[PDB]
Swiss-Prot record:
Changing I163V: In P9; increases fluorescence at 475 nm excitation. In R10-3; matures to the red-emitting state with excitation and emission maxima at 555 and 585 nm, respectively. Changing S198F: In H9; increases fluorescence at 395 nm excitation. InterPro entries: GFP (IPR009017), GFP-related (IPR011584), Green_fluorescent_prot (IPR000786). This is Green fluorescent protein. The lineage of its organism: Eukaryota, Metazoa, Cnidaria, Hydrozoa, Hydroidolina. Changing A202V: In EBFP1.2; shifts the excitation and emission spectra to shorter wavelengths and increases quantum yields compared to BFP. It comes from Aequorea victoria. Energy-transfer acceptor. Its role is to transduce the blue chemiluminescence of the protein aequorin into green fluorescent light by energy transfer. Fluoresces in vivo upon receiving energy from the Ca(2+)-activated photoprotein aequorin. Belongs to the GFP family.
Amino acid sequence: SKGEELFTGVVPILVELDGDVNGHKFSVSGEGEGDATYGKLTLKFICTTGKLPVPWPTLVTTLVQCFSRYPDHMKQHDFFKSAMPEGYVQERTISFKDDGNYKTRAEVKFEGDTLVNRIELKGIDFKEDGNILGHKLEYNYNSHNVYITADKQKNGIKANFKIRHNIEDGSVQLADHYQQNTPIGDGPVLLPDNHYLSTQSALSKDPNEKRDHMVLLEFVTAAGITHGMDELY
Ligand SMILES: [Mg+2]
């Protein structure tokens, strides 16, 4: 697709999130860049309202899959870039096992030459001292696959996946993700065969930053589609 042309180099990224979890209101602003050639994201997020009322790892998935590296042989399956520059709406339900849920709505689009992710997050039915509001989740992140399928009726896609958040006692907090993406513009998009995004995420801190924040290095690579290239060798 035509949109893929927008991603051949380093693209600046801005992320802005407004959240309410159990009446705890907060905002996050992120800045960095993406280079889809390497499936690579480098971002720093700051909670601009004070202390973040949920653990940072629980927000990683909400906080630009247009930066995934789609191998050449699978580029006809890249919905995300094909919707650019007009963008897409991304909605999720994130169900924390034995606890509350996030509902998110985002618009991901270009503003000039910057890729912007604007998000509203609503969390309900969290337990006062469960793993989320009780801050019992380690500051780390496990690799996962995002399983994508076409939704041709909506001219878009759906995804399903499980995030496993490590609890500080050695256990796991499951976060089931259900996702839908639909284009903002009316131009044609790519509707993919089933495949997945292999995602690896590393969380860190800026040693000179006093605000509540998260430094993220993430690699995202599309996979899962059959090719006959081995025959070439
Ligand atoms: Mg109720």
